[PDB]
Enzyme design. Structure first.
Site, PDB file in Angstrom:
ATOM      1  N   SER A  92     126.942  48.958 -22.219  1.00 55.15           N
ATOM      2  CA  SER A  92     127.556  49.581 -21.073  1.00 55.15           C
ATOM      3  C   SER A  92     127.414  49.149 -19.733  1.00 55.15           C
ATOM      4  O   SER A  92     127.644  49.657 -18.877  1.00 55.15           O
ATOM      5  CB  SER A  92     127.547  51.209 -21.335  1.00 55.15           C
ATOM      6  OG  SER A  92     127.793  51.524 -22.784  1.00 55.15           O
ATOM      7  N   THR A 101     130.068  51.571 -19.084  1.00 53.71           N
ATOM      8  CA  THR A 101     129.597  52.318 -17.816  1.00 53.71           C
ATOM      9  C   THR A 101     128.313  53.244 -18.335  1.00 53.71           C
ATOM     10  O   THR A 101     128.536  53.681 -19.530  1.00 53.71           O
ATOM     11  CB  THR A 101     130.937  53.314 -17.479  1.00 53.71           C
ATOM     12  OG1 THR A 101     132.002  52.087 -17.206  1.00 53.71           O
ATOM     13  CG2 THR A 101     130.539  53.930 -15.971  1.00 53.71           C
ATOM     14  N   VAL A 102     127.651  53.472 -17.439  1.00 52.95           N
ATOM     15  CA  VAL A 102     126.681  54.265 -17.824  1.00 52.95           C
ATOM     16  C   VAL A 102     126.718  55.617 -16.348  1.00 52.95           C
ATOM     17  O   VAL A 102     126.555  55.015 -15.393  1.00 52.95           O
ATOM     18  CB  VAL A 102     125.196  54.012 -18.145  1.00 52.95           C
ATOM     19  CG1 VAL A 102     125.259  53.125 -19.234  1.00 52.95           C
ATOM     20  CG2 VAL A 102     124.729  53.217 -16.858  1.00 52.95           C
ATOM     21  N   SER A 115     128.032  49.992 -14.017  1.00 53.29           N
ATOM     22  CA  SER A 115     128.844  49.084 -14.879  1.00 53.29           C
ATOM     23  C   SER A 115     129.029  47.917 -14.797  1.00 53.29           C
ATOM     24  O   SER A 115     129.087  47.303 -13.768  1.00 53.29           O
ATOM     25  CB  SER A 115     130.364  49.953 -15.152  1.00 53.29           C
ATOM     26  OG  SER A 115     131.012  49.426 -16.111  1.00 53.29           O
TER      27      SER A 115
END
Lengths: 535, 536, 537
Positions: A62, A351-352, A369
């Site tokens: 991610s 994504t995080v 991300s």
């Protein structure tokens, strides 16, 4: 053996409370990094950078060092916005990619969609400006995790295997080899419980630690990045990296029923959530679980999203203004198009994820991300810098505002949120997931302000998301009677069984009177809200 | 009027937590943090257990105390060991001394009378000395830090803290109960949500046992302070009672349940009940968990074994029958013959805080400690934060009962740590908090795991039942209604119970014997955490 | 106003009990018809005809006088099978339709996919052979409903509106006008609570009542049908209708764990249920709601269905035999292809449903359809005969066994089921819904035999259905953990929100010892199981 990945019964997550600090993210060891930095005298900002860099190693599906980043940080009674989104290579033009075969949209993978990774510089500027610890302190756990390795959880394993299996056949080129060397070292994606490590990741994180991110952009790592791209016909140069700097930008907001909902300004897509809230503002609700409520939600989101997709890009290349899209009379104009039947959405006119807070009133909404999973699939060899593919977001239609231009940064899906009431901070929120993001933002804002759900409950609540035209996806736990009543009103509702298709959220609310921190974590994934109570 | 309550309108999900190098699962997330910090500082699973146990002494005072006793099953060096940290009755506490004071049915729940020697401090020390890596002062330093600096009170802890205040503000008007109000209600009320509570008392005494290896508590300066306060209020607890307490390494007992071996601490402790019940139910096949048949057999077998355990289980010397007789296959068969289609009235036959830790080096611990009834006796030795247990209330005052009150005898104990094993390989610690629910919870998670293949979290998530009186069985709001109604048609007096926390709190860590990966589950009905650690 | 079509809370349907008579169907007034006929001295067969003809008026979205029909009737200790499926027009050949543009499959609508409506003849033959009352008695309520009219229920209103809205644009031809005149007389589809009537339906039902169905096939109605088709280039002639008779055919079965599961033989697709049960027979189960159970169900069904689609057609044109497909060693052969991963299914080698029962031990499983909703859209003017589109099932691939041939009847989706134990009748069952049908038969059979559910519970139970390859649709109420465990095993599972996409069922079980009747009705729709407790003689 004697246990699978089966959860036959519903579970409960209680709200987590703290005073002196709290980290809420999608990887428990990343939360642990932020806590460890809080311990070693760091503030919420330090913690954020600790967690963000940790995620770089802990959740490579991610994320990456080759990501860009965004943040809303509250500190000294003031909300600041950081735009760590990097721009397109200076040699990347619309006609250069037109002449190479692609003219609809540029390819998802390879050297072509790579824009300058803005996350490392965003780490450094965040530390320099508002952190207590040097970059080397705050990104030490991340380095430890990269050298020593970690056991892979079942959820991480699934997406890592999916990225291998699809990509083993699709990526047969020289460029993609270091990806397989880094992320698939045993000739396969890591299994559940298997330890994965990356000396590459450790070396480079140490390199940016000791240089304050200088090595990445205008140093030794910059040369390594430049060399590999030049060898494979990429557009990314030293000089592209060299004059990147993270931009302190002025956050934008909307009064929503007394509260103020904050997003990063354009470049980023947070505008959409703001506009949607602004359209929906005109209706009253009272209770969450009615057909009426989901309808107005869904329709307002639809109007605002086609607007955002038409107009939101690099501020300079925007056709209309932020102030125009966010005006009460334009809200009213769009809200007039909401009827009883489900509309087909069209544009208008004029994504995080990671959350931290501490006892001293500092709070941060941080998000980064590689856009599409691992990203471009370009990993600069032996360094574990998985490059993002953010450039894929550019339009190749010259009349579109987000048209590909050299040195321009694109419409960005990554959006950190912040909530405020009467110039008092109440906290960071964010709901991961690409184009789900504003819709998740709308939902947690409405869940909180309108319907009085606690941070965990707000996350727990069943979710919808709009995709195409009248198409709306809903969760298996979405109320079926309401779902069927929406169909009768014209919505093409699909119940989607996919886990993780509805995004990942974290929330930390701070009570302005007592100061007590209340946190919620995403129940759909591994993750944690964690408290810290030292000095 | 703000923007949230204690309302949870929607169902949530807890994914199984995975680790390799270390895991701690308990009912207080900062207690879990302590054991992690100890693992970080070079401690093993045993160290972490002690870290966590002593932390809980401060972080969850509604279920715990320094004046608790404790029990553990610890797996280390390929061998399971049992620690009986239950202390005995004061030497001056006799049946006729309490008979002459008014009480003859059962001894009072509160005051100096039901207090037996707190065995938990000694248990901490002996655990450290025998199987830990760190000195006691290392492993109980976070607990000291939390006592001195203080912590914010969570909504759940606040509820039980307010319940213990409101009921007891009126019931406890005596000199003995004053230090409890000074320690646990220092603002003239029970702490509110988000309010910080601290106790210098707790810090001082924890430091005192840290520096003495527990000696101060039993045969040192703390022992003298304990003796003095009791002597001043007509108590039976003496220096010499404390002075010759030793935790006892005892031999764990087991049952072969479908290949697995289910382990409990032997009598004194009530773990027998789960073992016997499993042994009765063993003779039936099941296949699926959520049928009327399955819940019927569970409930009935548990009823039979529980009335046996209540009849026979006490201090081993005073036991009328043997452990071996109650656990035999032919006695199992005898009791299983009494299970019919109608719900039986159960008769005897013939011849708290839970905590789980594991590390990468194959050490694992099931640890559990309690003051018995919430805060316990309400006797707090002044200025030291030692809340004394009321465990002695478990003694019978009927002279013909095996668990009759006798000086220097330790009672039928509700606290039971469980362990699961397969082919002399450890699979892990488990426990379900909650008084007389405990064996019933043990039965349920063991069947959930072995029979029905549920993961650690799912096994904990699963709806629960518990037998109380005769045909009386309480079930959770989430117990399947059709099955509940079908149980009623078979004679069971089923009652759906809305009370939160009335069905106990569980923790589970399983270890895969091949790969060595740790999979953990935590109690969803309360605040709490399974947390991983992955350093060196 | 102050109430929609919202049902926020779950409801309860208790099993219905009777002794002297029971009718179970998808329209409450249709059930009422069968009860009234039982009252006037009729038996279960009479009641079935009453209810069937009633449904012709009461649920026109699933039915018509121009339907064909099927029945399994238990009377005098013997199970009988009625094949009321009509054959293709004698002028309808593969090369005649090939020359007209269509070569993949023939069109769903118009005069082209119409085969001879077999249902009116099936009514008459059922009455003549096993009924107590003359056809004019048993189809009188149907007539009364058509003349006086009935208020349209919300569910019926939805499908009637859907049929109007889609079709107002697609049907712009002379042929489709009488459909609009008959079923949309106010220039739209009937609203909720609006009374709809049809003098046409009344007249023609009276005409077949007074002729014992003779007027429909070789009488005056036959002439009206022939004339309208000849005027619009159809293939249906007088002579096609004239030599139709309903065929008494011999029912086929399988031993399923002591019970016998009965279906109508080929032509009809009941074979699929039977073969699937026969594959799944070799596994044990013990409990219903496991991933294991659903997997084996779904896999077995899959193998059987691609077999049934390959081989089942008019018995004479069948490439293999029924006995071969239903054999234990062939079951074993297919069951070896069931693994742990979800297979891609390949062939092997060598609507209205209704149930009635009475006190005298008579029981019937009855089903009739126009195939696709209203059917072909051809309505013979002023008579209310909505013609079926059953010929759409024919293949235009000459090498397929179900290839279009003149005078041949096609692979038929309508399947009435019967359950039996040790030559005792236990009862009629069916689950409505096109290609869902055998899958619904497999589910109720396993719910009943394997898992011991009562008739209502068996119907209440969440449903799955296979469509394409690895594609399986499930209900919103299908357990989510199990669904997702099926996905990890390779199944392309989709939760389908559509109401009614998973069929409608009815069940009546008779206890062989006491004689007590226990009924279940489809909860997903309007409908009823009703009791009757009066007297004969």
């Amino acid at each position: 053996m004697f246990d699978p990945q089966s959860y036959p019964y519903p579970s409960r997550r209680n709200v987590v409370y703290a005073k002196n600090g709290m980290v809420a993210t999608s990887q428990p060891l990343a939360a642990q990094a932020g806590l460890d930095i809080l311990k070693a005298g760091g503030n919420a900002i330090d913690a954020a950078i600790a967690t963000a860099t940790a995620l770089t190693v802990l959740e490579p599906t991610s994320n990456g060092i080759g990501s860009d980043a965004f943040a809303l940080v509250w500190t000294k009674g003031k909300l600041h916005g950081l735009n760590g989104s990097g721009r397109a290579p200076m040699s990347l033009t619309m006609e250069a990619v037109k002449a190479k075969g692609y003219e609809q949209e540029l390819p998802p993978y390879g050297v072509i969609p790579v824009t300058v990774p803005g996350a490392p510089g965003a780490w450094a500027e965040l530390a320099k400006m508002y952190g207590n610890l040097p970059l080397a302190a705050s990104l030490a756990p991340a380095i430890r995790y990269a050298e020593e390795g970690y056991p892979v959880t079942p959820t991480l394993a699934k997406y890592w295997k999916a990225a291998y299996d699809r990509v083993k056949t699709e990526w047969t080129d020289d460029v993609y080899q270091p990806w397989f060397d880094t992320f698939a070292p045993k000739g396969r994606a890591p299994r559940v419980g298997e330890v994965w490590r990356s000396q590459g990741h450790a070396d480079t994180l140490r390199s940016i630690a000791e240089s304050n991110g200088e090595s990445f952009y205008r140093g030794e790592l910059a040369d390594q990045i430049h060399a590999f791209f030049d060898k494979h016909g990429g557009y990314l140069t030293k000089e592209d990296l060299a004059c990147y700097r993270p931009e302190w930008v002025e956050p934008i907001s909307i009064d929503y029923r007394g509260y103020r909902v904050w997003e990063i300004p354009p470049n980023g897509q947070g505008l959409v959530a703001l506009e949607a809230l602004n359209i929906v503002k005109g209706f009253e609700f009272y209770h969450k679980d009615t057909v009426d409520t989901y309808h107005k939600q869904i329709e307002a989101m639809k109007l605002a999203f086609v607007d955002g997709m038409k107009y939101v890009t690099e501020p300079s290349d925007m056709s209309v203004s932020v102030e125009q899209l966010l005006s009460d009379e334009y809200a009213t104009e769009r809200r007039k198009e909401i009827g009883e039947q489900a509309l087909t959405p069209e544009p208008g006119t004029p994504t995080v994820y990671l959350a931290t807070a501490d006892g001293d009133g500092n709070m941060v909404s941080f998000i980064q991300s590689n856009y599409m999973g691992f990203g471009s699939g370009v990993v600069v060899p032996g360094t574990g810098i998985a490059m993002q593919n953010r450039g894929h977001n550019f339009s190749l239609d010259p009349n579109h505002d987000n048209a590909l231009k050299p040195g321009k940064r694109t419409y960005h899906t990554i959006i950190p949120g912040f909530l405020t009431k009467n110039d008092q901070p109440i906290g960071p929120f964010g709901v991961m997931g690409g184009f789900m993001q504003p819709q998740g933002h709308m939902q947690v804002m409405m869940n909180t302000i309108d319907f009085g759900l606690n941070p965990q409950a707000a996350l727990d609540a069943p979710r919808w998301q709009w995709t195409n035209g009248k198409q709306v996806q809903v969760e298996p736990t979405f109320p079926v009677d309401i779902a069927q009543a929406l169909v009768r009103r014209g919505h093409k509702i699909q119940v989607v069984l996919d886990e993780g298709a509805f995004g990942r959220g974290q929330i930390i609310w701070r009570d302005p009177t007592t100061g007590v921190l209340a946190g919620g974590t995403e129940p759909r994934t591994d993750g944690q809200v964690a408290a810290w109570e030292g000095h």
